[PDB]
Write a protein that binds this ligand. Structure first.
Ligand SMILES: CCN1CCC[C@H]1CNC(=O)c1cc([N+](=O)[O-])c(N(C)C)cc1OC
Ligand SMILES: CCN1CCC[C@H]1CNC(=O)c1cc([N+](=O)[O-])c(N(C)C)cc1OC
Ligand SMILES: *[C@@H]1O[C@H](CO)[C@@H](O)[C@H](O)[C@H]1NC(C)=O
Ligand SMILES: *[C@@H]1O[C@H](CO)[C@@H](O)[C@H](O)[C@H]1NC(C)=O
Ligand SMILES: *[C@@H]1O[C@H](CO)[C@@H](O)[C@H](O)[C@H]1NC(C)=O
Lengths: 533, 535
């Protein structure tokens, strides 16, 4: 037996597996339980630490995926299926995965912890695009990723109740973070250098660990890709969460205690079947069961917490892709399809806006339409299509990111910002969607280094650059290569200069102002307008 | 008669006139100055519609400009040429309804297209006798017959108690219409063609031209129209009947005064006493707002200009409209703290916020917020140079550029032939500071061809430039097309259309075609702002 693949953790012994990366072997420990299975009476409850086990636990394979909705928009299409569960569904899903170099690091190595996205309703740490072997082999990183409960199972809340207090999926993440503190040194990981990174809902989660004190002692740096804790979709008020929960109960034939008891008798798929039916309006980029402002995990709204927080000892890397909104349009806006160029009329654009900005009053929706219309080409379908994408991307991601970056920088944080502008040569979505939400991930994780994936050689060089930025950020809080003696360097984002860089096949270019004018509209004007309409 | 120049003697409906032979750079022109076209609107006639001048006996001398209508005299920068050039250059009097005619010398052989100038000055000031309105160059170089009239301004022209018999309102506009009627009856005696009459005017003069377009009885008195930096629509050119009445009565009170009785009392007041209070009736601290302006009376103006341009059929209309590069800058020094001609007027963010309230005086807090948000450069939200320029742009866009854009769009969409320009050349002779750019009113001297006068020290290029502009304006008057039909080599000036939104740059360089008259920003003013108001 290979002693490199044998680790003792607090819970007992486990056996990992030696995997091939293009440049060498890595050690992988997959399917490690970090919690008691949250099943039966444990449904909707906070996670509890996994009890110890006898003998040697088999950690050579990915564990089940947390119970979730499965996308059927384009059955069998690679672009959608790549996000779908790639293992069996189960509520027994609280496991994490660790990749280290082979052999085990001689000295304590910086840890990256990945938190998957998926709108808080889906996702899994076992997807191919989250494969940690490349970062492990090439950058010598210790990489961790955990499953956490999504949908009703992770976020259904009757605020105040003992049996569905909300945010349990965030607690799953936190428990995993605790597990890393207590165990990662056994793998050669350094618990004094832990960097969280995540995309979309994963980024929002990272943001919430920043804004929740008990998490703060479990990591040192953060990366938020295309997602924030502030903004329109990442959280709900207690009242809205309570509302969605009792509506769901009503929908499945179900006093908090009684209501939750009856929900607990329901087969998992019965809950999933009605998950989407509780949203207050017809919308896109909106998810039924998400973190709730409980006054506990989140002591106040993310907006309020970023405004008043002290972030002096924090380093954050945040960024967006070129076309944040395009992906979501095919999931609710009439006129949009992956199978044509989605050229839309003016009427369709106005209709699309009420759906993309579902909380907007008539006047607010009018403001949006008039801001985004190109008055030189008010009825041009190509521009109306691209504007619809921009409305969704800006409202949900770009402007919330700009707001976050600004508050963090102003309040002591060291911040680096990017925009990712390279569209994968292997992308299966149409050209009109550009660089869609989620398609920087395969580059950060270094998938183009696998020659069987048919990425171009420029893309391989690109991926290697990104892996260096991310790992260097993990190691130091500064994504700049300490061996690169060339201008330009990646400068910190500040409120004065507002510098950020473009990530693409060309060398780093420095830009100023992350949609400054348009985000002033979203971040400064619209709230005034809503609180008056 | 018998020993004088036989080429300077002309008879009009009211009697005989003797004009004067004037020297223009390229030769002599005929001038007939101070021709009376109405009975003096004095005494019991104050605030009343003008009556046609009754015939005189003998030969009326028409060799000098007549009185300037009673008005406020600008004292902001006493003695400074930049202000004094707009001030009265003849005696102030309520007896001021006179007009001027320039024609070639000797007078034209065949009927000649007529240009009629209507001066600006916010409806509270102005005169046809100012140097910048000298018709000698257009007459000499282009062979134009040019006419300009004095019309009543301020309280005298526009104080209204709507519905009353003694102060119906808009009488300054009726002064103008009467002059237009005078041209129809009499211009043929000078060689002018009453069947080709083009109105042109700047600022309030432009707004006046627009109101003639929108008022049925004026429509039969002209054929084409030019509106320079002004429109009948927009925030300043008209007030509601209720607002006019409110201002009229407040003014009456401030000077010691049933409508009949109130107006009777106002008629006993010295002209100067009215002038001394006219600024005091404005409802807010403001700039680009004027107390006594045309009123929406349901008569001269059957409805608001906005409603009239929206639902009008303008198939018969050919218009030339445009703006200068810095419409707003001139106005900032008349009321926005931080601004002066004597320094760079770099301002703080605080002064910008306050300036916006003054520049958009009718704005709610939310609307003002929208304005500040839109004009702020969020990369440099506190840069004083940018803030100064933004303040200017706020005032210029709100009052002129966006109302012009609105007018061009409605007219084009409704059958009119529209030509649009932006004027971007700053006179080498300008006495205002550089920060003001090309201020409101400073294209006028070029259109009238003043740089042809060697004593004025314009550059040779400005002289060539002026000649180009006179060509465009006179070609438009002649044909409804500013382009020279016998050139083709020169770049062409395409019509403004809703589909392409083309306009040309007017400067020292050959015409350049651009698209969208501040399309994005003017969508804010013209489409979003009003909806924010009705909320
Ligand atoms: C659109 C981008 N995503 C993120 C991960 C992969 C892909 C999957 N699907 C979505 O994110 C997604 C979104 C919405 N929505 O509200 O926009 C939606 N509605 C039915 C309302 C449904 C969705 O998937 C089934
Ligand atoms: C500012 C442009 N004009 C037009 C012709 C020359 C010059 C003359 N002066 C004005 O037009 C002018 C304007 C305003 N105003 O409303 O901004 C104003 N007050 C607010 C009192 C006073 C003014 O003159 C005394
Ligand atoms: C694209 O296809 C969808 C459904 O197949 C349809 O709703 C839409 O009208 C189409 N758009 C175009 C560009 O024809
Ligand atoms: C310019 O002049 C005016 C009036 O004297 C003054 O109020 C303003 O503050 C001045 N600005 C500067 C930068 O001197
Ligand atoms: C033009 O130039 C001459 C010579 O310098 C000068 O004396 C005269 O005053 C100037 N004229 C004007 C109108 O400024």
């Amino acid at each position: 037996e290979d002693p490199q693949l044998l680790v003792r953790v607090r819970g007992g012994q486990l056996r990992g597996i030696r995997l091939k990366a293009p440049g060498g072997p890595v050690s992988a420990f997959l399917g490690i339980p970090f919690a008691e299975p949250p099943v039966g009476s444990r449904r909707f409850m906070p996670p509890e630490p996994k009890r110890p086990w006898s003998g040697v636990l088999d950690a050579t394979t990915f564990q089940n995926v947390c119970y979730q909705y499965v996308d059927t928009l384009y059955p069998g299409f690679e672009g959608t299926e790549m996000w779908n569960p790639n293992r069996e569904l189960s509520e027994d899903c609280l496991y994490l995965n660790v990749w280290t170099p082979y052999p085990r690091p001689a000295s304590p190595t910086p840890v990256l912890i990945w938190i998957y996205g998926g709108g808080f309703y889906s996702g899994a740490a076992s997807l191919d695009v989250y494969d940690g072997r490349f970062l492990a082999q090439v950058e010598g990183a210790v990489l961790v990723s955990m499953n956490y409960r999504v949908g009703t199972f992770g976020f259904l809340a009757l605020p105040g109740s003992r049996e569905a207090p909300g945010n349990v999926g965030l607690l799953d993440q936190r428990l995993a973070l605790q597990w890393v503190q207590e165990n990662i040194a056994a793998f050669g990981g350094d618990p004094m250098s832990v960097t969280l990174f995540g995309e979309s809902a994963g980024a929002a989660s990272v943001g919430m660990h920043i804004l929740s004190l008990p998490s703060r002692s479990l990591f040192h740096r953060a990366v938020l890709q295309s997602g924030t804790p502030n903004g329109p979709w990442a959280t709900v008020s207690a009242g809205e969460a309570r509302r969605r929960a009792t509506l769901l109960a009503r929908l499945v034939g179900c006093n908090d205690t009684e209501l939750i008891a009856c929900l607990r008798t329901r087969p998992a798929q019965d809950l999933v079947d009605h998950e989407w039916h509780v949203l207050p309006q017809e919308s896109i980029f909106r998810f039924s069961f998400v973190p709730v402002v409980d006054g506990d995990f989140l002591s106040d709204t993310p907006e309020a917490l970023i405004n008043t927080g002290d972030f002096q000892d924090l380093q954050v890397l945040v960024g967006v892709v070129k076309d944040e909104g395009s992906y979501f349009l095919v999931y609710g806006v009439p006129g949009f399809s992956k199978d044509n160029e989605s050229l839309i009329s003016r009427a369709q654009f106005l209709a699309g806006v009420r759906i993309g900005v579902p909380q907007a009053s008539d006047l607010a929706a009018e403001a949006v339409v008039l801001h985004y219309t190109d008055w030189l080409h008010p009825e041009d379908p190509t521009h109306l299509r691209d504007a619809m994408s921009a409305v969704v991307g800006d409202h949900n991601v770009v402007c919330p990111v700009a707001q976050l970056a600004g508050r963090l920088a102003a309040q002591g944080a060291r911040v680096y910002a990017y925009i990712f502008e390279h569209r994968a040569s292997t992308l299966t979505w149409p050209l009109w969607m550009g660089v869609p939400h989620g398609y920087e991930i395969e580059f950060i994780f270094g998938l183009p280094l696998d020659p069987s994936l048919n990425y171009t050689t420029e893309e391989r060089i690109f991926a290697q650059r990104l892996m260096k930025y991310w790992t260097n950020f993990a190691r130091t809080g500064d994504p700049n290569d300490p061996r690169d003696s060339k201008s330009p360097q990646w400068p910190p984002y500040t409120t004065a200069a507002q510098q950020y860089v473009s990530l693409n096949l060309k060398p780093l270019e420095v830009r100023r102002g992350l949609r400054a004018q348009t985000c002033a509209f979203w971040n400064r004007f619209l709230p005034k307008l809503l609180s008056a309409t």
